[PDB]
C-alpha cells in the first residue's frame, strides 16, 4: 500500500503557523522560518519565566528603598529591623503597602527602627 504523505504532513504545519501570527517577515508566512523562530520563542519564555521571579523582586526592592527613604532609614536597615521584630511580610506585599497606603508603611518603619540594635556598628 502506497501512502501519499500529505494529510499527515499538513498537521505540524498549521499549528506552527497559528502560533507564529504577529511576526514580521518570512517568520510568519513560511513554515521553515516559523519553526526556527518557535525554537527561539519558546526558549525565550523558559528563560524568562524563571528570570521574572528575579525581576519583580528587583522592582519591589527599589520601591521599598524609595519609600524607606521618605522615613529616613535605608533598605539595609529596614529588613534587619523587620526580621528582628519577627515581621515575615514578603516584599511584594511590603511594596504594595508603600505605594497604596503611606500611613501603614510608616508604622512598619517605626517598628523596624525601634527593634534594631542600639549600636548598629558594634560587634554582636
Partner RNA sequence: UAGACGGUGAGAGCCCGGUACGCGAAAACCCGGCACCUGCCUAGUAUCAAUUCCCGAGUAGCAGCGGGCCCGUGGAAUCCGCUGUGAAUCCGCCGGGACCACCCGGUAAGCCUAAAUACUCCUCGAUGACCGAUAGCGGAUUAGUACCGUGAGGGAAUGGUGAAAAGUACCCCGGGAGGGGAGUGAAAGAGUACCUGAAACCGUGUGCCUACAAUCCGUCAGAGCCUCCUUUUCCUCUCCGGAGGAGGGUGGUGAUGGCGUGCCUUUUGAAGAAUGAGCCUGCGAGUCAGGGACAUGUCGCAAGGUUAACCCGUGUGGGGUAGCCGCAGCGAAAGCGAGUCUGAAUAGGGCGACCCACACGCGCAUACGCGCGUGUGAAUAGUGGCGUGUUCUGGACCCGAA
Partner RNA sequence: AUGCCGUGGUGUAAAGCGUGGCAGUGAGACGGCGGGGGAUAAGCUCCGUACGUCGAAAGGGAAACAGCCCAGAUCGCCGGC
Partner RNA sequence: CGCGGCACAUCCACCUUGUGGUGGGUGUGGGUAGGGGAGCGUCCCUCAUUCAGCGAAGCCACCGGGUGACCGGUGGUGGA
Chain residues binding RNA by CB under 7 A are 1-15, 18, 21-33, 36-37, 39-41, 44-53, 55-57, 60, 79, 83, 90-92
Please state, in angstroms and rounded to a whole number, the distance separating the CA atoms of residues 61 and 94: 9
Query: How many residues sit close enough to Mg ion to count as binding (CB under 5 A)?
Result: 1
Q: Which is nearer to Mg ion, 79 or 106 (CB)?
A: 79
User: How far apart, in whole angstroms, are the C-alpha atoms of residue 101 and residue 23?
Assistant: 42
Residue closer to Mg ion (CB basis): 6 or 103: 6
Torsion angle of alpha carbons 9, 15, 18, 21, nearest 10°? -80
Q: For residue 31, what is the enclosing H or E element?
A: helix 31-46
Strands (E), the chain: none
CA 113 to chain CA mean position, Å:
29
Distance CA 38, CA 70 (A): 46
> From the list 22, 25, 86, 123, which residue makes contact with Mg ion (rule: CB under 5 A)?
22
- Least gap, CB of 79 to RNA (angstroms): 6
Residue closer to Mg ion, measured from CB, 22 or 25 = 22
| Shortest CB 67 distance to RNA, Å | 15
Least distance in Å: CB of 70 to RNA? 21
CB of 48 to RNA, least distance (A): 4
Amino acid at each position: 500500500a502506497r501512502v501519499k504523505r500529505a494529510v499527515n504532513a499538513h498537521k505540524k504545519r498549521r499549528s506552527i503557523l497559528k502560533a507564529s501570527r504577529g511576526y514580521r517577515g518570512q517568520r510568519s508566512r513560511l513554515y521553515r522560518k516559523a519553526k526556527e523562530q518557535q525554537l527561539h520563542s519558546l526558549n525565550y519564555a523558559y528563560r524568562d519565566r524563571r528570570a521574572r521571579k528575579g525581576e519583580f523582586r528587583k522592582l519591589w526592592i527599589a520601591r521599598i528603598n524609595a519609600a524607606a527613604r521618605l522615613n529616613d532609614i535605608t533598605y539595609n536597615r529596614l529588613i534587619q529591623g523587620l526580621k528582628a521584630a519577627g515581621v515575615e511580610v514578603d516584599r511584594k506585599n511590603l511594596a504594595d503597602i508603600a505605594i497604596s497606603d503611606p500611613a501603614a508603611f510608616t508604622a512598619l518603619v517605626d517598628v523596624a527602627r525601634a527593634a534594631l540594635p542600639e549600636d548598629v556598628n558594634a560587634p554582636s
